[PDB]
Amino acid sequence: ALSAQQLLNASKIDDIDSMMGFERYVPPQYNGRFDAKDIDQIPGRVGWLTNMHATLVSQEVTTNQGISGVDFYFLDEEGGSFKSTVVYDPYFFIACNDESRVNDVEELVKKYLESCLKSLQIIRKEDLTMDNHLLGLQKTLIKLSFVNSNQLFEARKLLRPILQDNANNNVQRNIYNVKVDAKHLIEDIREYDVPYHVRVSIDKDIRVGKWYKVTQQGFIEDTRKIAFADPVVMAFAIATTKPPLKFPDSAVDQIMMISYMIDGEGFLITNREIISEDIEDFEYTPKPEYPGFFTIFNENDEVALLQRFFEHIRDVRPTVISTFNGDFFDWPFIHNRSKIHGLDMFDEIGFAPDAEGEYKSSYCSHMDCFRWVKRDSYLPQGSQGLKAVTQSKLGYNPIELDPELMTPYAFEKPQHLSEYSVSDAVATYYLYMKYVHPFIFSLCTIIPLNPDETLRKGTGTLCEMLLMVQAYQHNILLPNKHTDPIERFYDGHLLESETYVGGHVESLEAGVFRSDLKNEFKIDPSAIDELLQELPEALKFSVEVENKSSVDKVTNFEEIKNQITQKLLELKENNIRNELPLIYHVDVASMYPNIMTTNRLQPDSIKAERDCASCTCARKLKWAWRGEFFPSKMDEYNMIKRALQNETFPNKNKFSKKKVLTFDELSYADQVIHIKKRLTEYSRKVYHRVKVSEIVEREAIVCQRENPFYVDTVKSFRDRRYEFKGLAKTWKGNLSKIDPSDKHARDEAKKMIVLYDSLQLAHKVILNSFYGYVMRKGSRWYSMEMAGITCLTGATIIQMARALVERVGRPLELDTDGIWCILPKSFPETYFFTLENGKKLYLSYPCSMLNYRVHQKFTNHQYQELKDPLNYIYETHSENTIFFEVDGPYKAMILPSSKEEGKGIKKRYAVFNEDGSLAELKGFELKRRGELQLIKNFQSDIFKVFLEGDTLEGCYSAVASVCNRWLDVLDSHGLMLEDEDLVSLICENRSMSKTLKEYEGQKSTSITTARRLGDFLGEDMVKDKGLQCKYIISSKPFNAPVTERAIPVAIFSADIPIKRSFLRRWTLDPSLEDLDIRTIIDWGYYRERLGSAIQKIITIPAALQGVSNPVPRVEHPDWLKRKIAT
DNA sequence: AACCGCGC
DNA sequence: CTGAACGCGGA
C-alpha cells in the first residue's frame, strides 16, 4: 500500500540520478570463487564510494511489494560515475526469559506476525549483563527478518502491546492455580531501532571514502587504493534584497546575485532587474593559494538567474555542494523564489527539504560549512561568522559590507556589491576544500554514515556509531537506549536533579607575571629533599617510560643527574629567594580518556554486587554524587498529589475533540511536571527554599576482566588523535628549529600548524564525548558511576600536582588537569640525555618529576587481559597512561581579580609568547559572542600594554594611561566621538536562543529589546530563534530596573516621526523633543560597567601585588580600602 | 542569597 | 534528536 508509493519516489530518484550521471550498474554474473586476493581477475567495476542512501527496489519468492536495500554512489577511475545497489533483509531480535521454551515463543510469533514476517531463526550473541558470559556462555535470541522496513515497523506495532500488557497488568483468573502461555516468555525486543542504512553499512562493512570493486558477490574493498578520488565540488552564496532594518523575506524579496565556485573556477550570476550594470569578468584572489577568476552571467531577471543556476548545476554534475548556513538561508530562499516563478527545484536539480527542514539530494552531498564550524572548529561562538572563520582558518581578511548597504549598492555601486558577493563564494569554497572536506570524508572511512549525516550528527552520536561497530564485530548484543527515571527520591525527598562532582578548578593568584620581573619565592626545603630522594628513579622513568629507552644506552645519565642535584641543593640552602620566574603550563595529555583506559573504565564493567561470580578481580573506585532535592517530605509529596487530583488540565494532543482531562489521565511524565511546580511553591513557604544540595561519597566496583570493547574503542580513537597532536607539535618545532630565519615562504609551516591544530582539536571533542556519552540521554551504555569515577580520580590527580608545585614555586590558576604556575629561574628545567647512537632524548624536569609521582600513585596494578581466548586464560598487569606535558616558558601571564574580598576569578587570563604575540586569551568578554562592545574594545587595547615598563609599577602605569583614555570617553559623554562610532561602541548584542514567545514570565535586556523590535518593526522580526538583540540602556524612566530600559539601537535609524513616537513610549516622556542618542544614554550605567572591568583587570590586582591604585578615578571597594590600614 | 540564560 | 564548572549581570 505505502510500499507502492515509496517505489514511486525511488523511481523518481533513479531518474534524477541518471540525469546527473549515476546509472545503476549491475556487475556481470560470475560463478567462480568470491575471493578477495585476485581482485583484478573478477568481473565488476572499481569505484571510490562517495555517498549512500536507503531505498526500495522491486523484484524487477515474495509478492507485489518492494525490497529494502541501499544505493551506493561511486566515482570511477576514468572520470565517470555510477551507482550500484545492495539488498539486505532488515531484522531485529526477541529475547526470552525462559530458554527451555524458546521453541514455544518461536511458534507463537511465526503465527502472530504471519502478515509481516519474512523468516526467523535462533541465534546467539554475547550479553555483557549475563552471568558467565566470560566463560563463553551466550544469550539465545530469536532473529526476525523482514522484506523491508515497513514490514519491520508492523512487527514492532504488533509486539509493543504484548510487552506493555506483560509489564502492566496482572491477569488473575483461578486464584487457586497459579502451564504458562507464550506471550509472557517474551521479555523484550533488541536492536529494533538501528537505522537501516547504518545496519547495512555495519553488517556489510562498507564505508564512504574507501574504494571497492563491485561484483556479483558484493563489494570488495581495495586495500591497495587509499587516496581519495576527486569529486566535482561546487560552493555557492546568494545575495538578496531586503527592506531597511528588517530581515530578507522570500515572499517578496528577490535574489540579486549568486556567486559560486566549481573546482576552483568562479561564476557570478547577476539579476539585471536589480543590478544596475552588466558586471564584467574579474579576479579576486586573496592569496596565491586561493585563485578566484570569476566569469559573469548577466541575466535579465530573477527567473533567468535561477534557470541559469540550475542549468549550470546540471551541466557539471557536482557531487558536493557546499554553503555557509545554506540550510537555513540560501537554500530555502532559492526554493521559495523557484516556486513563486513556477519552477520545480526538485525536477530541476534533485534537491528538496527533508524531514528536518534541511536541503538534501540523492546524488550530491550538501556540506554546510556552518555545521562543521559549530561542531568541529573549536572556535568560540563570537568567532563563528564567515568573516571571523575566514581570518582564523584561511589567514586573510575578506571583503566586508554592511547588510543595510547591499540593496542600495545594487543600484549605486554594483561593482562593490559583486566583489563582496564573490568574496563569500571564495571563502566558502576554500574553507570547504581545506577544512571540511578532508575531515568529513576521512571520518566517513570509519563511521558508518554518509557525508551529509557525518557532518551533522552530534559528537555523542558519532561515538555511539563507533561503539556499535565494535560491539557488532565482537558479536555483542547491543543494549537498548536508556531512559531516565521520571522521578527519583533520596531520604524520602523528591530529587529535582542528580549529578556528580566534576572537574576541579582553583584561582590562587591574581596579578601581572613577567619573565623580566622578579617574584618572591618561599621554597619548602622538605619538598626539595623528597625530589632529591626520588631523583634516581624519576630520571630512569623519564628514559624508560616517557622516552621508551634504556638507561643502558644513555651516555650522560650521571652528568644530567649531578646538574639537577646541584640546582636543587642550591634551592634547599637558599630557599627564600627573589628572582625572575619561569611561567609554565602543565596539562595532562587527553586526561579523561587516559584515566578511563588506565582504570579500564567502561559502563559494562561497573558491577553492583552482580555478577562476575565473584567480583581478586574487583577494582573499587570512588565518586562523589550530588543531589538537589525539595525540602518537602513524602507525606507532603502525597498531599500535593491529591490536591492536583481535584484539578482540571488541558488536553495537549491537538488531534482530539476532548480538551479537559483529569490528573489521572495525564501521562506519568506530565503528572510529575505539575507535581514539581507545586512542590517548588510549597517548599519556599514552609522551609524556605527550592533545592537542598548534598554531596555523598560513593564507591563502585570496576571489574578488571570484562569484555573490553568500549575502552578499546576509546584507546584506538585516542591514538588516532595523538598522531595529529604529534604532527601539530613537530611542525611548531621546525618553524623555530632553523626554519624561522627570515626570509622564507614558511608560511607553509604556519599553514601546517593551523591545519594539524584544527585536526587534533576536531578529534579532541569526539574523543571526550566517549566520556560524556555515558551520561547522554538515550545512551546505549549509560553509567553515572563511570563518569563520576573519572572526574574524582582526575580531581585527586590534579590536587596532588598542585600540592607539589606550591612547595617549589607558585601556582597561579588550575583547571581540571592543568596548572599555570611560576617557578624560580634557578629551578632545574630542560636537558637532553645522549644515546650511544648519538641521538638525544628530551627531558623537562618539572614535568617528569610530576609524572614519576603520578605513576607511583595512580597506576592500576589490577588490569587484566585475555592472553589466550580459546582457554580463557587471563594475564594481570600494571597500566598507566596518564602524563603531564609542558608548554612554555612564557613572557607573561595576567590574571584578574574579583570585586569581592579574598575571591579570585577562574577561567580568565591572558598569556603572551616571548616574541610579544598573544598566546592565549581565555574567557573574557572580548572573546564571547555578544557582550558590551565598549568592554571588548577596552580589553582589546589593554592586555598587550602589560608588556610595557621596566618595573611592576611602570607596567601598571602604562596600562593606567589606557584606562584613563577610555574613562575620558565616558566622562566626556562621548562627545569626542563620531555618531556612528558612538552607537557601535555603546551597543550590547545578545542572542536569544529561542523565540520571544517561549520566554514568557521572564525578564532580561534581550527579551525587552526583542519585544520592542517587534512593536516597532513588525512581528516578522521575532518569529525565528537566534535573534541578535542590539540595544542601549536609557537613563529614563528614572527608577525603572535595567531590563525596562533596553532600547533597540535600530530605532536610531528610523524616520524621525517613528523614532519620536517610540523613544517617548520607551522613556515615558510624552513631551520629549531631543532625540540624540547622547541624551538618551545612561552614562552612569556605562561608567559603572567600565569601572568594574578596570577593577578586576587593573586596580585590584595592582593592590594585591602591593601597588597603589594606578587608576585613581576608579575607587577601590571599601573592604579593600579597609584592608590597607596598619 | 539563591536562581537563571548564555557562552575544562 | 557528550559531560560539569564557572563569570556576569540580571525572596
Ligand SMILES: Nc1ncnc2c1ncn2[C@H]1C[C@H](O)[C@@H](COP(=O)(O)OP(=O)(O)OP(=O)(O)O)O1
Ligand atoms: N568537550 C568536552 N566534553 C567532555 N569533557 C571535556 C571536554 N573538554 C574537556 N573535557 C574534560 C575531559 C578532558 O580530558 C579534561 C581536560 O581538558 P583538556 O586538558 O582541555 O583536554 P584533554 O586533556 O582531553 O586534551 P589535551 O591532550 O589537549 O590536554 O576536561
Ligand SMILES: [Cl-]
Ligand atoms: Cl566554547
Ligand SMILES: [Cl-]
Ligand atoms: Cl555553547
Ligand SMILES: [Mg+2]
Ligand atoms: Mg589535558
Ligand SMILES: [Zn+2]
Ligand atoms: Zn570481575
